Amino acid sequence: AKVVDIRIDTSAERKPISPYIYGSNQELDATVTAKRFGGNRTTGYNWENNFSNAGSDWLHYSDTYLLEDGGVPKGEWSTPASVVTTFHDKALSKNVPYTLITLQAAGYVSADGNGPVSQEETAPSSRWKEVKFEKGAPFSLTPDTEDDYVYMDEFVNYLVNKYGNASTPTGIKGYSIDNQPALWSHTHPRIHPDNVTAKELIEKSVALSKAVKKVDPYAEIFGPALYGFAAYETLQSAPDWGTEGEGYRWFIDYYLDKMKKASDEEGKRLLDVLDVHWYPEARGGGERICFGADPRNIETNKARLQAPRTLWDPTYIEDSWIGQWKKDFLPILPNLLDSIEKYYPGTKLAITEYDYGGGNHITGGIAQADVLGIFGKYGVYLATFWGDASNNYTEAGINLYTNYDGKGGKFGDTSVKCETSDIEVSSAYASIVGEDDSKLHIILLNKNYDQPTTFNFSIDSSKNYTIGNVWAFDRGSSNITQRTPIVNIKDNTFTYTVPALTACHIVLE
């Protein structure tokens, strides 16, 4: 009989949970709170005509993929920025409060949609248009598709003209400095064949941020959208890191410090959100937990359940090259936040791409719910899952926070102290609404694989809870269903036994 104690104090460690951590990149069967237009295809996206290039993902094809996949009405395929306005229109219509749009910085964007770009057509060539951050001439809402340039500030001006600036209810709140710069030479060799240098990335990041903020002073700039740890540490062995990195523990510090320096010289913040991608390298049963992980491998599924701990738990060492050789940089979120506090205080943190795998398996759902609780508890500003609508359990994990009852019910927006006596078999997150603890929300995750877990709850609150309604998902179904309410609460204490591998959302009143 596994017994775990959960202790909550609704008046302690109160901290706001950013509403934007429950987002996605793709169109999911879930209620999301942020939408990101990013990924490989956005690097060569040309807002003037909507063409883009697949890079290594599809034989370096320049075509209309983004229009097709974005579901843009065919009559608007030739309208400037239709891929993006369709994207943002959809977010607004779904009551999504944050839209993050990736801008182009690798250097060139598709000039046409004529198919594969040969190596002999590597930019510059007739297949590409050079990107310039500042037009330096009056903007036009009808960009010239005949010249050799595409302007980023003109692109942003077009969007601001249509939706208002970032401080308004319909404005696009953030822009990203391209996508995974350290992989430009690998994913987009026809655009940027040489490996990005640290100097180049900083110069471009500063120039583009300045350009964007002149048009919309309220827009938040996200960067550098690093693909993974190797990029965090050395920008994938950047050619000039041996010189530029002298005195820096890792590239993350250099980036923050240089953006801070540029901001101090310019007179305003040029980097609003440190943006990184985190695909867990955690392994189990001989395979990584994401990217083709087999739901039949129990050891992999068990490793998936514990992997979220690498984000915050100092005592957890996962089975991966990061867990083995990079302990000095783990747990990862605290290390990223520590760097921010040291080199550019006030900078926000966002995980714009991540996937814990097992999307159609209960463990993918529990891990997803665990990750969201962690993002909220540790202060992540925005997060957007990367994966499609086939990940039903991942979607259940999101809805457990954003729409647990099917009618808009959501986790509270203020995190409060909630401790569990066994962080290996369980995870628990608690929250209230605003500064009011009248309704206490609790996400309770039982990671026990084949046995129920009995939880003894002890709560310190100014309110005397009498009932706890429950919604949950498990191996029986990814659909979140209401369960029998908890009714025997004595002096804010109660015992609740949860079946193995179950994710619950308890609402006490």
Ligand X SMILES: OC[C@H]1O[C@@H](O[C@H]2[C@H](O)[C@@H](O)[C@H](O[C@H]3[C@H](O)[C@@H](O)[C@H](O[C@H]4[C@H](O)[C@@H](O)[C@H](O[C@H]5[C@H](O)[C@@H](O)[C@H](O[C@H]6[C@H](O)[C@@H](O)[C@H](O)O[C@@H]6CO)O[C@@H]5CO)O[C@@H]4CO)O[C@@H]3CO)O[C@@H]2CO)[C@H](O)[C@@H](O)[C@@H]1O
Name which of Cl ion, Ca ion, ligand X, none residue 77 binds, using a CB cut-off of 5 to 8 Å depending on partner kind.
Answer: none
State yes or no: residue 232 binds ligand X (CB under 6 A).
Answer: no
Closest CA to 175 of 87, 60, 51: 87
Question: How many whole angstroms separate alpha carbon 422 and alpha carbon 84?
Answer: 45
By beta-carbon proximity to Cl ion, the closer residue of 255 and 494 is: 255
- The minimum distance between CB 59 and ligand X, in angstroms, equals 8
Query: Has 319 been labeled as part of a binding site?
Result: no
Query: Which long-range contacts does 90-96 make (Cβ < 8 Å, 24+ apart)?
Result: 90/27, 90/35, 91/35, 92/170, 94/31, 94/32, 96/23, 96/32, 96/33, 96/34, 96/35
Query: Has 98 been labeled as part of a binding site?
Result: no
Q: Give every CB contact of residue 29 below 8 A, 6+ residues apart in sequence.
A: 389, 392, 395
Question: How many whole angstroms separate alpha carbon 306 and alpha carbon 304?
Answer: 5
Please say whether the beta carbons of 203 and 107 come within 8 A.
no
State yes or no: residue 489 binds Zn ion (CB under 5 A).
Answer: no
Residue 27: Cβ within 10 Å count: 16
Closest CA to 427 of 367, 387, 356: 367
State yes or no: residue 230 binds Zn ion (CB under 5 A).
Answer: no
Selected binder of Ca ion within 13, 69, 147, 266 (CB under 5 A): 147
Query: Has 149 been labeled as part of a binding site?
Result: yes
State yes or no: residue 57 binds ligand X (CB under 6 A).
Answer: yes
Name which of Zn ion, Cl ion, ligand X, none residue 231 binds, using a CB cut-off of 5 to 8 Å depending on partner kind.
Answer: Cl ion
Please say whether the beta carbons of 106 and 192 come within 8 A.
yes
Question: How many whole angstroms separate alpha carbon 508 and alpha carbon 302?
Answer: 30
Instruction: Pick the stretch among 144-152, 209-217, 279-287, 368-376 that binds Ca ion (CB under 5 A).
Output: 144-152
Query: Has 395 been labeled as part of a binding site?
Result: yes
- The minimum distance between CB 396 and Zn ion, in angstroms, equals 9
Selected binder of Cl ion within 158, 227, 255, 455 (CB under 5 A): 227
Selected binder of Cl ion within 33, 49, 110, 180 (CB under 5 A): 180
Q: End-to-end distance of the chain based on CA atoms, in angstroms? A: 29
Task: Give start and end residues of each alpha helix (H) in 143-289.
Answer: 152-163, 184-187, 198-215, 229-234, 241-244, 251-266
Residues from 22 through 41 that contact Zn ion (CB under 5 A): 29
Instruction: Pick the stretch among 267-275, 287-295, 385-393, 410-418 that binds Zn ion (CB under 5 A).
Output: 385-393
Name which of Zn ion, Cl ion, ligand X, none residue 353 binds, using a CB cut-off of 5 to 8 Å depending on partner kind.
Answer: ligand X
Query: Has 218 been labeled as part of a binding site?
Result: no
Name which of Cl ion, ligand X, Ca ion, none residue 147 binds, using a CB cut-off of 5 to 8 Å depending on partner kind.
Answer: Ca ion
Q: Give every CB contact of residue 415 below 8 A, 6+ residues apart in sequence.
A: 13, 14, 15, 16, 17, 376, 377, 429, 430, 431
Name which of Cl ion, Zn ion, ligand X, none residue 389 binds, using a CB cut-off of 5 to 8 Å depending on partner kind.
Answer: Zn ion
Beta strand ranges found along 343-413 (DSSP E):
348-354, 382-385
Selected binder of Cl ion within 156, 226, 238, 322 (CB under 5 A): 226
Name which of ligand X, Cl ion, Ca ion, none residue 226 binds, using a CB cut-off of 5 to 8 Å depending on partner kind.
Answer: Cl ion
Name which of ligand X, Ca ion, Cl ion, none residue 358 binds, using a CB cut-off of 5 to 8 Å depending on partner kind.
Answer: none
Q: Give every CB contact of residue 14 below 8 A, 6+ residues apart in sequence.
A: 414, 415, 416, 432, 435
Name which of ligand X, Cl ion, Zn ion, none residue 68 binds, using a CB cut-off of 5 to 8 Å depending on partner kind.
Answer: ligand X
Query: Has 134 been labeled as part of a binding site?
Result: no
Q: Give every CB contact of residue 38 below 8 A, 6+ residues apart in sequence.
A: 25, 100, 102, 176, 179, 225, 352, 353, 384
State yes or no: residue 231 binds Cl ion (CB under 5 A).
Answer: yes
Instruction: Pick the stretch among 33-41, 148-156, 321-329, 377-385 that binds ligand X (CB under 6 A).
Output: 33-41
Question: How many whole angstroms separate alpha carbon 414 and alpha carbon 430?
Answer: 9
State yes or no: residue 58 binds ligand X (CB under 6 A).
Answer: yes
Query: Has 287 been labeled as part of a binding site?
Result: no
Strands 382-385 vs 20-24: parallel, antiparallel or unpaired:
parallel
| Helix, strand, or coil (residue 286) | coil
Selected binder of ligand X within 3, 12, 13, 68 (CB under 6 A): 68
By beta-carbon proximity to ligand X, the closer residue of 157 and 236 is: 236
- The minimum distance between CB 136 and ligand X, in angstroms, equals 31
Name which of Ca ion, ligand X, Cl ion, none residue 117 binds, using a CB cut-off of 5 to 8 Å depending on partner kind.
Answer: none
| Helix, strand, or coil (residue 106) | coil
State yes or no: residue 460 binds Ca ion (CB under 5 A).
Answer: no
Residues from 131 through 160 that contact ligand X (CB under 6 A): none
- The minimum distance between CB 113 and ligand X, in angstroms, equals 9
Q: Give every CB contact of residue 202 below 8 A, 6+ residues apart in sequence.
A: 255, 258, 259, 262
> Closest residue to ligand X, Cβ-based?
39
Selected binder of Zn ion within 92, 230, 389, 433 (CB under 5 A): 389
Whether the CA torsion 265, 266, 267, 270 is positive or negative: it is negative
Question: How many whole angstroms separate alpha carbon 429 and alpha carbon 440?
Answer: 11
Token code pair at residue 457: 């709850």
Instruction: Pick the stretch among 9-17, 60-68, 92-100, 181-189 that binds Cl ion (CB under 5 A).
Output: 181-189
Residues from 380 through 409 that contact ligand X (CB under 6 A): 386
State yes or no: residue 123 binds ligand X (CB under 6 A).
Answer: no
Distances (CA, A) of 173 to 101, 176, 220: 8, 11, 6
Binding residues for Zn(2+), as ranges, are: 29, 389, 395
Binding residues, as ranges, are: 29, 48, 144, 147, 149, 389, 395
Binding residues for Ca(2+), as ranges, are: 48, 144, 147, 149
- Residues lying near ligand X in the complex (CB under 6 A): 39-41, 54, 57-58, 61, 63, 65, 68, 179-180, 227, 277, 353, 386
